[PDB]
Amino acid sequence: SMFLPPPECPVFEPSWEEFADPFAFIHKIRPIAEQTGICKVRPPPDWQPPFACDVDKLHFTPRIQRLNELEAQTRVRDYTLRTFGEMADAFKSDYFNMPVHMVPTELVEKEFWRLVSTIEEDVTVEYGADIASKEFGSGFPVRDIKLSPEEEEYLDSGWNLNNMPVMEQSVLAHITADICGMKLPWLYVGMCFSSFCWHIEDHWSYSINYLHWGEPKTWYGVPGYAAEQLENVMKKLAPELFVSQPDLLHQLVTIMNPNTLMTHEVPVYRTNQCAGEFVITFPRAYHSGFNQGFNFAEAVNFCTVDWLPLGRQCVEHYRLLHRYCVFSHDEMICKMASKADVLDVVVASTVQKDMAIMIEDEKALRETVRKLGVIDSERMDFELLPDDERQCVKCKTTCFMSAISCSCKPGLLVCLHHVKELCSCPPYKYKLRYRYTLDDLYPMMNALKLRAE
Numbered sequence: 170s171m172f173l174p175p176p177e178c179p180v181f182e183p184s185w186e187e188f189a190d191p192f193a194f195i196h197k198i199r200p201i202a203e204q205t206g207i208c209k210v211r212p213p214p215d216w217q218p219p220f221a222c223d224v225d226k227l228h229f230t231p232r233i234q235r236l237n238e239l240e241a242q243t244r245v246r247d248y249t250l251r252t253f254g255e256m257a258d259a260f261k262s263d264y265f266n267m268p269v270h271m272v273p274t275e276l277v278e279k280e281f282w283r284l285v286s287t288i289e290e291d292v293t294v295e296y297g298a299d300i301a302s303k304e305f306g307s308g309f310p311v312r313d314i315k316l317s318p319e320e321e322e323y324l325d326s327g328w329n330l331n332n333m334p335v336m337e338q339s340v341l342a343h344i345t346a347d348i349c350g351m352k353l354p355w356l357y358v359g360m361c362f363s364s365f366c367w368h369i370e371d372h373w374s375y376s377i378n379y380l381h382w383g384e385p386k387t388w389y390g391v392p393g394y395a396a397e398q399l400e401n402v403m404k405k406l407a408p409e410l411f412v413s414q415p416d417l418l419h420q421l422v423t424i425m426n427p428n429t430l431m432t433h434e435v436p437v438y439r440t441n442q443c444a445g446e447f448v449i450t451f452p453r454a455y456h457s458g459f460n461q462g463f464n465f466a467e468a469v470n471f472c473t474v475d476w477l478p479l480g481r482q483c484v485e486h487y488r489l490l491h492r493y494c495v496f497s498h499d500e501m502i503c504k505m506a507s508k509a510d511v512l513d514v515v516v517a518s519t520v521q522k523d524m525a526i527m528i529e530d531e532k533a534l535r536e537t538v539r540k541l542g543v544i545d546s547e548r549m550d551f552e553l554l555p556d557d558e559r560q561c562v563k564c565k566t567t568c569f570m571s572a573i574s575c576s577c578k579p580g581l582l583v584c585l586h587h588v589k590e591l592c593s594c595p596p597y598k599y600k601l602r603y604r605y606t607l608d609d610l611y612p613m614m615n616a617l618k619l620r621a622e
């Protein structure tokens with residue numbers, strides 16, 4: 170009894186009516202799926218986008234992966250798709266001395282958790298993980314090169330993961346301070362035992378993952394509500410993963426047995442995602458897994474109106490951890506407000522709610538730094554500053570509403586939580602740099618209120 174598989178995560182089979190709008194559907198399943206963190210979505214049976222690729226003209230460089238539980242790996246030779254598949258299939262086939270398509274999923278799972286926990290075995294595999302480029306395009310059809318009408322039906326589908334980010338019910342859309350990390354689909358070419366470590370998404374966003382083809386992808390997921398609980402457990406067993414590092418290029422992640430989590434009463438769910446199925450991860454929902462064999466997946470992050478409050482909670486949490494932000498949440502809120510006329514009216518209503526909190530928090534923060542003896546002030550267009558030039562020098566948060574500077578430490582900023590941390594000149598030498606006066610802010614919100622009624 171080495172491995173006791175976690176209970177199955179929820180599986181949805183939307184009707185074509187239900188399926189019509191992804192954000193509508195995702196909102197409907199949310200009460201269920203956020204209780205399990207991950208869920209699986211089976212498109213209607215005839216929904217099948219064409220995958221078409223030259224297996225010989227796609228090259229990529231693969232990440233080498235040693236399979237050791239609790240060992241630190243960082244988030245992020247040449248193969249064609251075909252050479253990789255030849256390698257992948259030969260590996261699984263030899264590992265089990267079985268026909269590569271005949272190994273039971275149960276067994277691959279059990280064997281995965283055995284080999285990551287045994288120190289004698291030093292199994293190393295290779296993964297491909299990379300964004301859509303001209304050198305490595307989407308597995309979905311994109312508008313250009315000429316498409317068949319089969320491909321054009323799927324060109325504008327909500328579930329084409331290229332359109333998913335930029336749709337109307339979506340929030341990361343009209344961000345202009347762009348991410349690419351979170352706007353653009355990622356492609357994963359898997360092989361047997363290649364894995365992805367426990368993580369949650371940047372800014373606690375949703376993600377959606379489509380397995381285009383090949384053998385299944387096994388997932389473990391934890392509901393967002395048990396996030397910290399999982400983190401406590403992981404802290405206890407692998408504390409060097411929690412040594413805060415100088416960038417998001419350094420955040421440490423690990424493979425860890427879901428049985429270990431279950432023993433400590435952290436709820437874990439599993440699923441085998443098969444070709445043509447979607448997995449959706451909910452905000453702050455931890456997840457990990459491994460591939461059963463040669464396969465091809467595409468994934469993208471996204472943010473709904475449901476998420477906006479969590480997005481603010483996350484940036485707050487990021488500041489306590491002194492973790493770097495991918496983008497400014499406030500800055501996004503204000504870009505939206507400044508486009509209140511062309512916003513979906515449910516979106517505008519939700520932004521207004523978040524903006525009202527932002528403004529009230531900002532009011533109190535400014536009152537506080539005033540009582541500290543910071544008197545001087547000057548407007549500053551923070552969004553013009555490269556991110557490295559507007560991070561709080563203590564908590565590393567990306568400044569947008571306001572910051573404090575000082576002639577004594579030129580170029581340096583702190584957010585208004587860390588006024589004491591800028592330098593040691595007296596606070597009459599400090600300057601409050603701010604994007605907006607409170608008087609600017611209230612009209613922006615009223616624009617949102619007018620749009621929503």
Ligand SMILES: O=C(O)/C=C/C(=O)O
Pocket residue numbers: 357364365376378386456466468
């Ligand atoms: O490795 C993958 O295919 C996916 C990981 C994820 O969606 O987090």
Ligand SMILES: [Mn+2]
Pocket residue numbers: 269270
């Ligand atoms: Mn096969």
Ligand SMILES: [Mn+2]
Pocket residue numbers: 236237238284285286287288289290291292
């Ligand atoms: Mn090992």
Ligand SMILES: [Mn+2]
Pocket residue numbers: 368369370376450456
């Ligand atoms: Mn993920």
Ligand SMILES: [Mn+2]
Pocket residue numbers: 489
């Ligand atoms: Mn602090």
Ligand SMILES: [Zn+2]
Pocket residue numbers: 488561562563564565566583584585586587
């Ligand atoms: Zn700060």
